[PDB]
Amino acid sequence: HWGYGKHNGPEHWHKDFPIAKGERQSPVDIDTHTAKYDPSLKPLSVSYDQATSLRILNNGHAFNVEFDDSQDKAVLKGGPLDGTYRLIQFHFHWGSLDGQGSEHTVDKKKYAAELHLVHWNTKYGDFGKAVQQPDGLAVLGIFLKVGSAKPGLQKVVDVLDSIKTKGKSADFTNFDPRGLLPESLDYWTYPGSLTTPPLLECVTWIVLKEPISVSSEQVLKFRKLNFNGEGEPEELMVDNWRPAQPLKNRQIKASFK
Ligand SMILES: CC(=O)Nc1nnc(S(N)(=O)=O)s1
């Protein structure tokens, strides 16, 4: 089954998921000089004050923090979006070294990791229906660079020891995702896809310009997780990122000049 190894990594995915070679795949390189400023784009509206986190899970490819999405508690609106998108989970992609890890790149620059806050369009009723629609998901992408620690991330880092291996989960309540946002909400946006199988082309990507900084010690703890289940041979969970895909017939728009 698929993964990030030499024998099952992204270059192999198309054999089981032919849409991997599709017209609106993600991630992409953001060429800052070719992106188009669009004055018609609205500011993002992030309403996370009533967010209810439930659980943190190692699913064998990353760790996910899951939220209660049975009501409009944590929602994303505005920007390029029509309607209301509910937060369902966030996760990260990261590297084995500080010079790599992000999925998106900016003028070919890679960051140490990338945070994805995944939201689904409420008009489709559930997440499973949403992924079948071209406007079904909105994913907010935030870059991480190594520098000073991010206090708001430390609660996540401290629980990782309890979900070291695939399939382990832990109760993870009262986490406030607002502590993971940068100061500015300036963004680029383009139409794209999930970056893991099944690679469905259902995502409006919103990638923030401003990275957040985390400390070397914080990212080091991500790299101690395992792809494998308990009792299996240890494989460190690192480099769980898909390389940039061709832009083809898409334009990246910027909310700022
Ligand atoms: C269930 C779920 O959320 N699946 C996802 N697959 N890829 C995602 S990402 N890397 O594009 O945010 S989210």
Ligand SMILES: [Zn+2]
């Ligand atoms: Zn992701």
